[PDB]
């Protein structure tokens, strides 16, 4: 993986052929005007490999854009604190899948299993997790729930966040009074 | 600090890829040609069988032989011999490939094309060559 355009590869190939022909011919002399046995079978493999690499890169760029928009969603406060948050997430997922933005189904499984992990260090986390628990989608033919795709160890951390925040407030109040 | 190829690598390291492709091509190919010629010249003076050589000569040849190895297109190389051992095209005639070496979706979606003939010998065919995996074979023997 080095190139990014067809033209660069073509120029590289041209120069390398024009050099190696002369070098190999003059190694034992002979005559360079005295190499062309199978050309189609080599061009086919070269172009197939190039096309496959370009496809992989496009797929990766799409995944990055998806990540940026999900992170932008994940930062807002009064949407998570709101009692209606799971509906928006499922609507976004459905729209993305029906517009072929997400390339496949395993990618959907990855994004669903990652959003749960990401939404622990936020403010409105327990509310979102508890109100997105019981909704169903159809993946690879078989229908399943969001809870079943994963299988009660994240709820506790979601609560521990606010416990820590309250402790900090209490300490700050004690410091202020003692200083005054 | 005056060898033609000993300044090419330095200027490639310093300037980088800010220039076009052809200059990088030549700068990289000079040393490759030099190494190939040197190794081939040393190999020629040798013997063939390993039972007629001294110790140092065997070690030298064993160390230096492997720079001629290639891995990616061995099948296209060996395609020629198997046809003659077992028996006894302008892209358009191929199926699944367009004139510009791109995939043709019309046929593969309408006519239910079984497979794509990247190379020759896919027309008809009695040479088999069934793909295998090294680890399955290793478990099979042991």
């Amino acid at each position: 993986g080095e190139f990014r355009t067809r033209q660069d590869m073509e120029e590289y190939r041209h120069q390398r052929l024009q050099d190696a022909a002369k070098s190999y011919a003059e190694e034992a002399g002979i005559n360079p005007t005295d190499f062309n046995d199978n050309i189609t079978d080599r061009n086919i493999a070269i172009y197939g490999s190039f096309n496959k690499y370009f496809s992989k890169q496009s797929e990766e760029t799409a995944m990055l854009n998806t990540r940026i928009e999900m992170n932008s969603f994940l930062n807002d406060g009064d949407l998570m604190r709101s009692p209606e948050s799971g509906k928006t997430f499922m609507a976004y997922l459905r729209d993305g899948l029906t517009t072929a933005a997400i390339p496949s189904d395993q990618r959907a499984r990855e994004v669903i299993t990652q959003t749960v992990r990401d939404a622990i260090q936020k403010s409105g986390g327990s509310n979102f997790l508890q109100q997105v628990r019981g909704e169903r989608i159809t993946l690879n033919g078989v229908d399943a729930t969001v809870e079943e795709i994963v299988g009660n160890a994240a709820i506790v951390e979601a609560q521990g966040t606010e416990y820590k925040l309250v402790a900090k407030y209490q300490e700050d109040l004690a410091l202020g009074v003692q200083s005054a | 600090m005056c060898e033609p190829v000993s300044i090419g690598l330095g200027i490639m390291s310093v300037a980088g890829a800010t220039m076009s492709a052809s200059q990088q091509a030549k700068a990289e190919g000079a040393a490759i040609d030099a190494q190939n010629r040197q190794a081939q010249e040393m190999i020629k003076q040798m013997n063939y069988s390993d039972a007629n050589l001294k110790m140092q000569e065997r070690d030298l040849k064993e160390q230096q032989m492997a720079e001629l190895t290639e891995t990616t297109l061995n099948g296209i190389r060996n395609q020629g011999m198997v046809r003659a051992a077992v028996a006894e095209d302008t892209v358009k005639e191929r199926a699944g490939i367009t004139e510009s070496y791109n995939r043709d979706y019309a046929a593969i979606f309408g006519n239910r094309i079984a497979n794509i003939e990247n190379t020759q010998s896919a027309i008809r065919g009695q040479g088999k060559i069934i793909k295998t995996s090294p680890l399955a074979h290793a478990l099979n023997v042991a």
Binding site: - | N74, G75, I116, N118, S121, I129
Partner: peptide
């Protein structure tokens, strides 16, 4: 990175509807 290249295939097997 780049653990090992992938050898070129003889022919490719696909499916259809």
């Amino acid at each position: 990175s780049v653990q090992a290249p992938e050898p070129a295939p003889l022919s490719e097997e696909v499916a259809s509807v």
